[PDB]
Amino acid sequence: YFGKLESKLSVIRNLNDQVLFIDQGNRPLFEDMTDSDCRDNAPRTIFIISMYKDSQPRGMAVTISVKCEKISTLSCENKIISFKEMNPPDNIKDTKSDIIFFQRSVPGHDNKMQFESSSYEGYFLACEKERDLFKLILKKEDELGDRSIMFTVQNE
Amino acid sequence: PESCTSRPHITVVEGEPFYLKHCSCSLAHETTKSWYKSSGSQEHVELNPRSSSRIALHDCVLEFWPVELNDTGSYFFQMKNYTQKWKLNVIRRNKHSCFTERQVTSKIVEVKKFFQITCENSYYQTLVNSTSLYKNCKKLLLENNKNPTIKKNAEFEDQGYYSCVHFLHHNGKLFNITKTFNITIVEDRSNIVPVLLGPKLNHVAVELGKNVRLNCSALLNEEDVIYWMFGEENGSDPNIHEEKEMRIMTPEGKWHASKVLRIENIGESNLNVLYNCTVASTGGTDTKSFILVR
Ligand SMILES: *[C@@H]1O[C@H](CO)[C@@H](O[C@@H]2O[C@H](CO)[C@@H](O[C@@H]3O[C@H](CO[C@H]4O[C@H](CO[C@H]5O[C@H](CO)[C@@H](O)[C@H](O)[C@@H]5O)[C@@H](O)[C@H](O)[C@@H]4O)[C@@H](O)[C@H](O[C@H]4O[C@H](CO)[C@@H](O)[C@H](O)[C@@H]4O)[C@@H]3O)[C@H](O)[C@H]2NC(C)=O)[C@H](O)[C@H]1NC(C)=O
Ligand SMILES: *[C@@H]1O[C@H](CO)[C@@H](O[C@@H]2O[C@H](CO)[C@@H](O[C@@H]3O[C@H](CO)[C@@H](O)[C@H](O)[C@@H]3O)[C@H](O)[C@H]2NC(C)=O)[C@H](O)[C@H]1NC(C)=O
Ligand SMILES: *[C@@H]1O[C@H](CO[C@@H]2O[C@@H](C)[C@@H](O)[C@@H](O)[C@@H]2O)[C@@H](O[C@@H]2O[C@H](CO)[C@@H](O)[C@H](O)[C@H]2NC(C)=O)[C@H](O)[C@H]1NC(C)=O
Ligand SMILES: *[C@@H]1O[C@H](CO[C@@H]2O[C@@H](C)[C@@H](O)[C@@H](O)[C@@H]2O)[C@@H](O[C@@H]2O[C@H](CO)[C@@H](O)[C@H](O)[C@H]2NC(C)=O)[C@H](O)[C@H]1NC(C)=O
Ligand SMILES: *[C@@H]1O[C@H](CO)[C@@H](O[C@@H]2O[C@H](CO)[C@@H](O)[C@H](O)[C@H]2NC(C)=O)[C@H](O)[C@H]1NC(C)=O
Ligand SMILES: *[C@@H]1O[C@H](CO)[C@@H](O)[C@H](O)[C@H]1NC(C)=O
Ligand SMILES: *[C@@H]1O[C@H](CO)[C@@H](O)[C@H](O)[C@H]1NC(C)=O
């Protein structure tokens, strides 16, 4: 069981300081952005991280959301990353969820953050270069020390 | 080799060589590609090889040599059915500084932690004659002219504006690409593992019909949560109330957090039931349980 606690505004960045944003096609992407660029592209660059209480605690249970013409929530349904048109729910009556992720700092680096899927164990939110784009994808951990599954969240 | 400009809004400084690359370069291999500009309600115009002596149209990129204030506007690219839009905002150059303040990328680094600045420009490196690194418009002497690099453990004195200036040539004319980093050195956040104060299993003697305030306290970090689990899956006992959190900062800058679960009108339904209090963090979680007994 998950119960919505509180939400915060955050700027998610990969370990290359590339700002995560939802583009015109509602795809989550990563791009180098000057402070001005990050602001001028807001709200596409501003994410609502919502904390949840967990029935069986296993790290900080959160939902990543974005507020454009409509509020969309990040989902990893079928191991495929998408932004479902919905608000973070008040309640979740399951121990696993396509929208719940476990935010965990990396051991020794309290600023480097990883997001484990509650539905697909050992599957993490990651930045992958696909063609001339940096895409937000779901990836299995693989080799320990993987910097692609590590992020930084900047709060206001 | 260079990534496409996928973001919708772009901010550039006047007099700097600028480009915007579309996100279908492999596609640009199958004469059926066009670039357009729309000035303040001008309802677009098709750009051509010599529309402007500064604008160079290529299959994947639209080069500006250099970009100037009159270039501010909406740009649209069309290849068969692929379409891409950019809102270009050319800002005025601070001719009194070595960089415009409105074109900085801020970075906060914790004191004594690794700190590195590297000057690189993948796109124009073929035309780059020299590249210099300045700290608050004072040229630093780092042997490298190609990629001046600072690699050290951060100190409060390292705070400052680091500008990478890439000097290059295009048909005799000299230009530069300045990129500034606003570094801010802060004290070590030194996060702790959240710890719930008191024993893991607590038995609290109560009497039916009366009320009870189950106190839960922890030592945690500013961004950590403390909450109670008392069976809210399809509505909890209406007599159970989770009180407002209380926090007192420790001298070490950490927090003493308190959350009280108030069980009013105690009944048999509250007895021999585990009421859990958890502390949750990016650094770990910890739960303690309370049992109500006669
Ligand atoms: C990357 O490239 C950009 C260009 O793409 C470089 O930008 C140049 O930066 C310098 C400063 O770093 C600027 O110079 C300053 O201009 C200030 C204001 O200038 C005004 O008056 C000018 C008057 O006319 C002058 O130029 C014409 C030729 O155009 C001459 O014929 C004439 O005799 C004059 O000399 C105007 O033209 C201009 O538009 C402005 O309205 C000045 O306040 C400033 O003064 C410094 O130097 C003084 C001595 O000359 C000194 O006493 C002062 O204390 C002070 O230090 C300085 O001249 C350039 O204007 C600017 N050019 C552009 C196109 O933006 C950038 O430098 C480069 N990066 C690096 C690191 O090289
Ligand atoms: C949780 O902590 C609170 C304190 O924050 C404890 O409450 C305190 O409970 C005692 C009795 O158990 C109260 O003291 C005495 O009781 C009478 C009752 O009529 C009261 O009026 C007098 O103050 C008297 O000294 C005390 O007032 C009360 N304080 C508060 C703020 O309610 C509570 O017992 C702790 N819970 C557990 C499970 O230990
Ligand atoms: C309060 O906690 C007990 C104990 O739960 C254990 O510790 C938790 C922190 C978490 O990690 C649980 O998964 C652990 O089981 C809860 O009781 C357990 O409930 C689960 C699921 O209903 C069940 O599989 C276990 O057998 C139960 N264990 C015991 C000792 O009863 C209890 O449900 C929690 N109370 C509330 C109000 O949610
Ligand atoms: C930087 O470039 C110069 C040459 O630039 C010329 O002058 C500019 C103003 C512009 O008109 C450019 O298109 C010109 O090409 C390099 O200088 C030459 O270098 C050789 C050795 O490699 C030397 O023997 C010559 O005397 C130089 N020639 C001239 C005309 O200056 C210089 O090496 C370049 N710097 C670096 C570090 O690459
Ligand atoms: C350089 O970075 C610092 C830190 O991010 C910026 O300082 C902040 O400025 C705002 C107002 O603009 C204040 O409300 C904050 O309290 C400041 N923070 C600190 C830690 O001082 C600074 O503005 C940045 N400079 C530029 C030119 O962007
Ligand atoms: C654009 O502005 C520059 C000066 O900043 C000028 O030299 C150029 O001719 C202008 N071009 C057009 C088409 O307005
Ligand atoms: C372009 O057309 C192809 C089919 O020919 C289609 O699969 C593709 O999705 C289209 N691209 C866009 C951006 O609509």
Author numbering:
A (entry chain A): 1 to 156
B (entry chain B): -1, 20 to 48, 52 to 315
Paper's wording?
Interleukin (IL)-18 belongs to the IL-1 superfamily and was first discovered as an interferon gamma (IFN-γ)-inducing factor in sera from mice with hepatitis stimulated with Propionibacterium acnes and lipopolysaccharide1. This proinflammatory cytokine is secreted by various types of cells and strongly augments IFN-γ production in type-1 helper T (Th1) cells and natural killer (NK) cells following activation of NK-cell cytotoxicity; thus, it plays a critical role in inflammation and the host defense against microbes. IL-18/IL-18Rα/IL-18Rβ ternary complex formation juxtaposes the intracellular Toll-Interleukin-1 receptor domains of IL-18Rα and IL-18Rβ, to which the adaptor molecule myeloid differentiation factor 88 (MyD88) is recruited presumably with the aid of TRAM6. We determined the crystal structures of IL-18, the IL-18/IL-18Rα binary complex and the IL-18/IL-18Rα/IL-18Rβ signalling ternary complex at the resolutions 2.33, 3.10 and 3.10 Å, respectively.
The IL-18Rα ectodomain folds into three immunoglobulin (Ig)-like domains, which are referred to as D1, D2 and D3, in the same manner as the IL-1 receptors. Within IL-18Rα, D1 extensively contacts D2, whereas D3 is distant and is connected by the long D2-D3 linker, which implies that D1 and D2 behave as a single module, similar to IL-1-related primary receptors. IL-18Rα recognizes IL-18 through a large interaction surface area at ~1,850 Å2. Two IL-18 sites, Sites I and II, contact IL-18Rα; Site I is located on a side of the core barrel of the β-trefoil structure, and Site II is at the top of the β-barrel. In both the binary and ternary complexes, the segment between residues 35 and 40 adopts an α-helix structure with a cis Ala42IL-18-Pro43IL-18 bond, which is stabilized by hydrogen bonds and electrostatic interactions with IL-18Rα. Surrounding Site I, α-helix I mediated the interaction, wherein the Arg25Rα side chain is buried within the β3-α1 acidic groove of IL-18. Two disulfide bonds, Cys22Rα-Cys41Rα and Cys43Rα-Cys81Rα, bridge the b1-c1 loop to the N-terminal loop and d1-e1 turn, respectively, which likely reinforce the proximal loop structure, to which the long β10-β11 hairpin of IL-18 is fitted. Around Site II, the IL-18Rα acidic surface, which is composed of the Glu253Rα and Glu263Rα carboxylates as well as Trp249Rα backbone oxygen, captures the Lys53IL-18 ε-amino group. In the IL-18/IL-18Rα and IL-18/IL-18Rα/IL-18Rβ crystal structures, seven N-linked glycosyl chains were identified in IL-18Rα at Asn91, 102, 150, 197, 203, 236 and 297. Interestingly, the core-FUC and second-NAG on Asn297Rα are proximal to the β4-β5 loop of IL-18 (<4 Å); hence, they likely interact through electrostatic and hydrophobic interactions with the ligand and partly contribute the unique D3:D3 interaction.
